[PDB]
Ligand binder design. Structure first.
Ligand SMILES: *[C@@H]1O[C@H](CO)[C@@H](O[C@@H]2O[C@H](CO)[C@@H](O)[C@H](O)[C@H]2NC(C)=O)[C@H](O)[C@H]1NC(C)=O
Ligand SMILES: *[C@@H]1O[C@H](CO)[C@@H](O[C@@H]2O[C@H](CO)[C@@H](O)[C@H](O)[C@H]2NC(C)=O)[C@H](O)[C@H]1NC(C)=O
Ligand SMILES: *[C@@H]1O[C@H](CO)[C@@H](O[C@@H]2O[C@H](CO)[C@@H](O)[C@H](O)[C@H]2NC(C)=O)[C@H](O)[C@H]1NC(C)=O
Ligand SMILES: *[C@@H]1O[C@H](CO)[C@@H](O[C@@H]2O[C@H](CO)[C@@H](O)[C@H](O)[C@H]2NC(C)=O)[C@H](O)[C@H]1NC(C)=O
Ligand SMILES: *[C@@H]1O[C@H](CO)[C@@H](O[C@@H]2O[C@H](CO)[C@@H](O)[C@H](O)[C@H]2NC(C)=O)[C@H](O)[C@H]1NC(C)=O
Ligand SMILES: *[C@@H]1O[C@H](CO)[C@@H](O[C@@H]2O[C@H](CO)[C@@H](O)[C@H](O)[C@H]2NC(C)=O)[C@H](O)[C@H]1NC(C)=O
Ligand SMILES: *[C@@H]1O[C@H](CO)[C@@H](O[C@@H]2O[C@H](CO)[C@@H](O)[C@H](O)[C@H]2NC(C)=O)[C@H](O)[C@H]1NC(C)=O
Ligand SMILES: *[C@@H]1O[C@H](CO)[C@@H](O)[C@H](O)[C@H]1NC(C)=O
Ligand SMILES: *[C@@H]1O[C@H](CO)[C@@H](O)[C@H](O)[C@H]1NC(C)=O
Ligand SMILES: *[C@@H]1O[C@H](CO)[C@@H](O)[C@H](O)[C@H]1NC(C)=O
Ligand SMILES: *[C@@H]1O[C@H](CO)[C@@H](O)[C@H](O)[C@H]1NC(C)=O
Ligand SMILES: *[C@@H]1O[C@H](CO)[C@@H](O)[C@H](O)[C@H]1NC(C)=O
Ligand SMILES: *[C@@H]1O[C@H](CO)[C@@H](O)[C@H](O)[C@H]1NC(C)=O
Ligand SMILES: *[C@@H]1O[C@H](CO)[C@@H](O)[C@H](O)[C@H]1NC(C)=O
Ligand SMILES: *[C@@H]1O[C@H](CO)[C@@H](O)[C@H](O)[C@H]1NC(C)=O
Ligand SMILES: *[C@@H]1O[C@H](CO)[C@@H](O)[C@H](O)[C@H]1NC(C)=O
Ligand SMILES: *[C@@H]1O[C@H](CO)[C@@H](O)[C@H](O)[C@H]1NC(C)=O
Ligand SMILES: *[C@@H]1O[C@H](CO)[C@@H](O)[C@H](O)[C@H]1NC(C)=O
Ligand SMILES: *[C@@H]1O[C@H](CO)[C@@H](O)[C@H](O)[C@H]1NC(C)=O
Ligand SMILES: *[C@@H]1O[C@H](CO)[C@@H](O)[C@H](O)[C@H]1NC(C)=O
Lengths: 420, 404, 211, 198, 49
């Protein structure tokens, strides 16, 4: 079929109509990023020549190809530890979780560590770690940080984020009550903070339920981890491609090097072995070139992850649609195999009403404008209200600043403005 | 390490070395132990050879060959071999050998090779393009000449049983017009058990040490061991993902042997800068500490190197065995990264210590539902950040680099 | 008449052990889901084409189908291949044997050798003058016909005997049922298990999913 | 060692050229590494075989170098775009973007040139000398709940103050420092006080 | 000339393809650039080299 681009929608635009959301939903959109790739390293002499002395000598005549390949792969290998450390090690102190969980009704228990596992991954980190899956001179080196060390850093970042807001990025962590941290996150999106406190139990239930929906999503749906599983698949497939190329003739009488040396005398055998060396070496150069370009793709993702860590875990980001859809509130990092997962908490507005609106109001000749928010009417009465959550306030000289007069402004409307 | 880096100074770090160790090795030889001698003293010596339209063909099997005495016989005007060299035939060996025998005019040797031209090769003795074996020929004017008009000519290996039936009236008075005999030996190097093998004597069998083995012609090198692989009864070799020999059945005892390469335990050398000290520690990647001297074949290794097998300064990381560093229970910033949470440093009385790296000072934020910490003062930092912006603009006259 | 071969007629391509690997190979194989010709022991011992190589099988309970004959003309003019499976023994020969067009077993001769409840499966082929036999014997659950399922035929024979076989026949005991199919050059994907054994396969040319 | 990045960019490019030069010593299976040996020792029918090995090897070495330099140039270009972004946002502006402009809250940055690079002196405010305080999200006055316009409520133990988030500066709680929103019932952890009306 | 980046991205891909195609004209040391010349003039054992 011809693909749908999305549902069609005529926006109800007109020169005096505004829709203001009367309610919200919190959301907890997962975002998944690769950070490192499986650190290979190759003994290029062992790969090309497999302990053959004749081949081990012949490969010397091709010069510093072999050592510059080991150098390139070593550069890639160290770059993985660098990528991993730049994403997680943004916090200098291992902040540990408080003994009592009085976070104003919010419930992080599914994303904080669990002492019940010998590696203390959180519940959601265990879902993530479950939803993702030799002699020919190839090797896989381990990461510098163990999966448990990564889980200490994601716990430190998280326990800082929960107890202290952005402050643990800017200096030493400052404790602040979680219902006071969220009032700061609400001012950071232009929602007046009383809209948190008057709705605190609702907002706690929306957040707690949204974390629950992530456990159901991750329990049911393996394809969410596609980015990380693809990064595992490509590196396993590149290794298996490089191994299977040992079986190819490249124009020699056999692809098995010990056949040639059992079957031909040295003057003949050198010509055959030059074909296998050239083929295997060209295959190794091909593999290393793929891994360099792929490591650059991973490093671009690692720098993005390190930036989302700095802006959205250690901070709150004004960058529209950078940290999940909706206005960003905060993000919790979770470790994952060769990657990171951010649980971007966002405020998404909902339950619109339409209102008649005016850019300004005339009182006694003076044109009044809102200090913050917009003018709206229910039909009969005019109110000023904040932009992102309908909250009608009486129009006053505290809520409004004067500038000039009724002559200049297009679409200005008459009203009383009250003097307190 | 100094050789791996082509440098007499080496900086603080961990370096994966190229293997330069002496690994002296010894040979091991294995074959089927049948005792019949092969009938080459019949084949190269028959009363009269066949006409090339209908050449002789004798299977040679279940016997010991002497390609050495044939290759050293002064009888032969040519001994040209294809896919094999005539020397190696004594050390390599075969499931079967087929000898094809006939007379030719001495001018016709051109037609007896893989894929060659001419009416004998087109009608009645096609050789495949990938023929493995030897073509051996000599003058027979002393025997096959008389003239002897019986000598008659006309897919690979098909006997070809107006008429195409051309023939030579060979006479002793003929010189390119003289008869020559030719034998072609075709060799069956398939994965079945060998039955024709060279004069080379089998040795005893050695296990759990690095050896230059031959089984039936497989002149490999590696650590032979016994194995648990359930071969099907007809299988004689077992193979890796690489299509390389991973296992064999021994020809004299039907036990299954693994093969494994020597020094697969990859070496990295952990060093402070040589401007600080000449002391180093060694990480053997992947291996288990109790196996290290066996894995690197320390039994035949330089004594100053051999100090890096055993010695109580030995530590099992998840990354592999670390030797010549001192394990420590304290934790510090990572000086040299080793892997899997381990780092080394050079410290005080001095040694290379190795430790689980410290992720940072541990802290509990003093949280409660009514406590806040507000800063009463500040410091203006001036953090410095350094970024690359360009690199050296090169331009290569590639004609002068390649061909100057 | 015909029947569906399903996944029958795979055999070990070489005398090599492989563990766990998905090996890829090209050889003369029976195409999957091919039309095999079906025969019954009633008024049989005809002469069929050999084509480029044969798959043969028989469903059994008492060894009524006891052998085979192969060649160009099967009439003593040439060294015909003859095979018999007689209880405690198995017999293979080539010679100028002579028979009428109705041979039965009573209830330049370069080679000569001696060693429904069930199905016996075989492959007979010639390449570069080397004749080969592969086989398997099994009990069967389906009483009627070739059972839908998979098992790799193990090698019995290689002979360098060089006969230009174009026709063949099977032999009955007289005072049972059997199948004939033909090999085609096919690329196959072969799944080896941990025990050196082929346990699944794909005929690559069968359909776009197999490709 | 602070200059490590810029010095490493110099080292990598010098190392790549010295590697590319040393590959001229490799004979790649030809009878010599030096082209004039082959041309003087062998006649054209034979020499064209050996020289084609050298051409193949030297060309493959040059292709390898150009491939490294293309990938390294992309790595440098990502750093140049990053540096240009810091120049635009961080020198030419003030950045809200946490830990993009050094560490601590950003004030301003001064660029300084360096060989093959740029250095930013990121001036940042870092807070210091914490005090602990008892705090509340809201203040009840006469049944109305008052919230701070800017900053937070804190107490020294005997009096309630409002103060800006990032530098302790207590102000008396007033109808100018605070906005009403509804009544006392709804807010978790609200505390009583007076709110002074100027 | 305002569209410099887009026209450059088009030009580079066209330049790369035309270079890849032009390389089919190159001998690389074979007796002809054109495969059908070799396959018509030479018998297999010579032609494969
Ligand atoms: C704002 O939206 C929320 C849902 O996002 C509403 O909360 C639900 O209210 C209904 C009754 O109307 C209850 O059955 C649900 O259980 C509530 N859900 C939760 C998560 O508490 C809320 O009532 C809306 N508020 C207004 C003023 O419209
Ligand atoms: C935080 O949420 C978890 C579930 O996400 C709650 O865990 C339940 O706790 C009760 C006892 O209080 C047990 O009976 C349930 O079996 C628990 N459920 C699970 C799935 O473990 C926990 O109580 C919540 N804590 C707070 C303070 O809200
Ligand atoms: C627009 O808002 C005003 C104020 O909320 C509404 O006026 C009040 O309406 C209610 C009944 O809905 C009365 O009980 C109050 O006494 C009214 N206040 C005054 C000062 O008269 C007005 O009705 C709303 N209009 C619409 C169309 O919703
Ligand atoms: C707002 O109210 C003023 C009166 O308070 C209206 O002004 C009058 O408008 C008519 C028509 O233009 C003129 O004839 C009068 O002279 C105006 N009087 C004054 C004092 O200016 C004005 O039209 C109203 N505007 C709206 C949008 O309702
Ligand atoms: C194998 O033997 C058959 C006969 O049994 C040969 O087939 C005949 O070949 C000639 C040409 O040489 C044709 O004119 C006949 O029509 C063929 N007869 C049949 C029944 O096909 C066949 O050529 C032999 N195979 C080879 C490779 O020589
Ligand atoms: C909390 O702050 C208030 C105001 O700074 C302090 O009250 C004053 O205390 C001084 C003595 O320290 C008296 O001279 C003033 O007359 C008090 N002013 C008022 C308006 O009462 C109070 O002492 C501080 N408490 C603590 C524990 O620091
Ligand atoms: C804030 O002060 C008011 C009184 O000014 C407290 O209200 C009284 O609370 C007690 C205990 O619940 C009741 O018995 C009284 O009837 C309440 N009086 C009135 C007039 O409402 C209130 O509890 C205080 N709140 C806090 C958090 O300190
Ligand atoms: C706003 O009013 C218009 C009137 O045509 C209507 O189409 C639209 O659906 C309304 N929007 C909402 C959110 O009620
Ligand atoms: C809105 O549009 C109408 C015509 O559709 C026009 O007459 C009217 O003056 C406009 N009002 C404002 C406030 O722009
Ligand atoms: C061939 O036979 C003669 C005797 O007839 C013998 O002297 C000679 O050594 C034999 N040579 C070979 C190769 O068998
Ligand atoms: C190998 O030789 C021994 C005697 O040395 C013999 O007993 C054994 O049967 C031979 N091996 C085989 C496979 O026959
Ligand atoms: C070398 O070591 C000495 C101390 O032995 C130290 O003063 C000097 O700075 C070092 N130089 C380098 C280049 O590391
Ligand atoms: C190391 O090898 C010994 C036997 O030498 C074995 O008991 C032990 O379990 C092995 N340990 C590891 C970590 O592999
Ligand atoms: C290190 O800790 C272990 C227990 O984990 C203890 O047995 C050992 O004596 C300690 N060693 C040192 C040098 O402190
Ligand atoms: C088998 O042969 C018949 C014609 O005899 C044909 O209709 C049928 O399609 C064939 N089977 C398959 C699987 O194609
Ligand atoms: C099988 O047949 C052969 C002759 O073809 C005979 O020697 C052997 O004894 C027979 N065995 C049985 C059980 O009939
Ligand atoms: C073998 O072939 C010949 C003709 O070459 C023929 O006379 C003879 O009868 C054949 N042998 C047998 C046993 O029939
Ligand atoms: C391998 O063979 C053993 C018996 O030796 C059997 O228990 C096991 O199930 C077999 N495994 C497979 C994958 O066939
Ligand atoms: C704040 O008070 C708690 C009371 O237990 C104390 O542990 C903590 O060190 C104090 N922090 C500061 C910065 O004074
Ligand atoms: C604050 O925490 C204490 C226990 O630490 C609890 O008794 C008290 O009710 C909590 N108060 C609020 C406002 O949450």
């Amino acid at each position: 079929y011809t693909m749908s681009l999305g549902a069609e929608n005529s926006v109800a635009y007109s020169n005096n109509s505004i829709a203001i959301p009367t309610n919200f939903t919190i959301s907890v959109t997962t975002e998944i990023l690769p950070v490192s790739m499986t650190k290979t390293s190759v003994d290029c002499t062992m790969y090309i020549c497999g302990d053959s002395t004749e081949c081990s000598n012949l490969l010397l005549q091709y010069g510093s190809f072999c050592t510059q390949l080991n150098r390139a792969l070593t550069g890639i290998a160290v770059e993985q530890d660098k990528n991993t450390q730049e994403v997680f090690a943004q916090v200098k102190q291992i902040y540990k979780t408080p003994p009592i969980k009085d976070f104003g009704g919010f419930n992080f228990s599914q994303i904080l560590p669990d002492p019940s596992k010998p590696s203390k991954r959180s519940f959601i980190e265990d879902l993530l770690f479950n939803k993702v899956t030799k002699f020919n001179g190839l090797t896989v080196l381990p990461p510098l940080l163990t999966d448990e060390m990564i889980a200490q850093y994601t716990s430190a970042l998280l326990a800082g984020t929960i107890t202290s807001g952005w402050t643990f990025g800017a200096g030493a962590a400052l404790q602040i009550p979680f219902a006071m941290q969220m009032a700061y996150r609400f001012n950071g999106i232009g929602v007046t903070q009383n809209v948190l406190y008057e709705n605190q139990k609702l907002i706690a239930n929306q957040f707690n339920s949204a974390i629950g929906k992530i456990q159901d999503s991750l329990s049911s749906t393996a394809s969410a981890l596609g980015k990380l599983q693809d990064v595992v698949n490509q590196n396993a497939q590149a290794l298996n491609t490089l191994v299977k190329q040992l079986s190819s003739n490249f124009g020699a009488i056999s692809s098995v090097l010990n056949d040639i040396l059992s079957r031909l005398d040295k003057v003949e055998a050198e010509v055959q072995i030059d074909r296998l060396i050239t083929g295997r070496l060209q295959s190794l150069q091909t593999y290393v070139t793929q891994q360099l370009i792929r490591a650059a793709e991973i490093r671009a993702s690692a720098n993005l992850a390190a930036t989302k860590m700095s802006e959205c875990v250690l901070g709150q980001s004004k960058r529209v649609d950078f940290c999940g859809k909706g206005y960003h509130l905060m993000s919790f990092p979770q470790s994952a195999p060769h990657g990171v997962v951010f649980l971007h908490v966002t405020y998404v507005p909902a339950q619109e009403k339409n209102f008649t609106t005016a850019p300004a109001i005339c009182h006694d000749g003076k044109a009044h404008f809102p200090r913050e928010g917009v003018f709206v009417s229910n039909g009969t009465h005019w109110f000023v209200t904040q932009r992102n959550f309908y909250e009608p306030q009486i129009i006053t000289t505290d809520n409004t600043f004067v500038s000039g007069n009724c002559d200049v402004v297009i679409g200005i409307v008459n009203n009383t403005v009250y003097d307190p | 390490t100094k050789c791996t880096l082509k440098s007499f100074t080496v900086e603080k770090g961990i370096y994966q070395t190229s293997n330069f160790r002496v690994q002296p090795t010894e040979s091991i030889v294995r074959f089927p132990n049948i005792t019949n001698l092969c009938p080459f003293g019949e084949v190269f010596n028959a009363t009269r050879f066949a006409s090339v339209y209908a050449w002789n063909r004798k299977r040679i099997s279940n016997c010991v060959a002497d390609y050495s005495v044939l290759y050293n016989s002064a009888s032969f005007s040519t001994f040209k071999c294809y896919g094999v060299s005539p020397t190696k035939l004594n050390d390599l060996c075969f499931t079967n050998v087929y000898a094809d025998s006939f007379v030719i005019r001495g001018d016709e040797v051109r037609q007896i090779a893989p894929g060659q031209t001419g009416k004998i090769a087109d009608y009645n003795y096609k050789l495949p393009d990938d023929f493995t074996g030897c073509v051996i020929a000599w003058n027979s004017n002393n025997l096959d000449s008389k003239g002897n008009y019986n000598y008659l000519y006309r897919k690979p290996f098909e006997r070809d049983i107006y008429f195409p039936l051309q023939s030579y009236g060979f006479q002793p008075t003929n010189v390119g017009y003289q008869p020559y005999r030719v034998v072609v030996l075709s060799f069956e190097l398939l994965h079945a058990p060998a039955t024709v093998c060279g004069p080379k004597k089998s040795t005893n069998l050695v296990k759990n040490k690095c050896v230059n083995f031959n089984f039936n012609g497989l002149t490999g090198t590696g650590v032979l061991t016994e194995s648990n692989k359930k071969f099907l009864p007809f299988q004689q070799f077992g193979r890796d993902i690489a299509d390389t020999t991973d296992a064999v059945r021994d020809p004299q005892t039907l036990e299954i042997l693994d093969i494994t390469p020597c020094s697969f335990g990859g070496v990295s050398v952990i060093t402070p800068g040589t401007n600080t000290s000449n002391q180093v520690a060694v990480l053997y990647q992947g291996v288990n500490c109790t196996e290290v001297p066996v894995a690197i074949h320390a039994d035949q290794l330089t004594p100053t190197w051999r100090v890096y097998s055993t010695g109580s300064n030995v530590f099992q990381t998840r990354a592999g065995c670390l030797i010549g560093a001192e394990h420590v229970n304290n934790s510090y910033e990572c000086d040299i990264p080793i892997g899997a949470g381990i780092c080394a440093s050079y410290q005080t009385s001095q040694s290379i210590i190795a430790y689980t790296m410290s992720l940072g000072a541990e802290n509990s934020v003093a949280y409660s539902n009514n406590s806040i910490a507000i800063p009463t003062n500040f410091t203006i930092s001036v953090t410095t950040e350094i970024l690359p912006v360009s690199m050296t603009k090169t331009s290569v006259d590639c004609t002068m680099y390649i061909c100057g | 008449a015909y029947t569906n071969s399903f996944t029958r007629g795979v055999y070990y391509p070489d005398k090599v052990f492989r563990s766990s690997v998905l090996h890829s190979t090209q050889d003369l194989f029976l195409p999957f889901f091919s039309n095999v010709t079906w025969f019954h022991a009633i008024h049989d011992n005809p002469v069929l084409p050999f084509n480029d190589g044969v798959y043969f099988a028989s469903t059994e309970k008492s060894n009524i189908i006891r052998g085979w004959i192969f060649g160009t003309t099967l009439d003593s003019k040439t060294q015909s291949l003859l095979i018999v499976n007689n209880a405690t023994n198995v017999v293979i020969k080539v010679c100028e044997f002579q028979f009428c067009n109705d041979p039965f077993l009573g209830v330049n001769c370069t080679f000569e050798y001696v060693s429904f409840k069930n199905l016996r499966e075989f492959v007979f082929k010639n390449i570069d003058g080397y004749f080969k036999i592969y086989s398997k014997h099994t009990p069967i659950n389906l009483v009627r016909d070739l059972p839908q399922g998979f098992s790799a035929l193990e090698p019995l024979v290689d002979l360098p005997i060089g006969i230009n076989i174009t026709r063949f026949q099977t032999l009955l005991a007289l005072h049972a049922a059997y199948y004939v199919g033909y090999l085609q050059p096919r690329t196959f994907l072969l799944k080896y298990n941990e025990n050196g054994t082929i346990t699944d396969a794909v005929d690559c040319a069968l359909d776009p999913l197999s490709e």
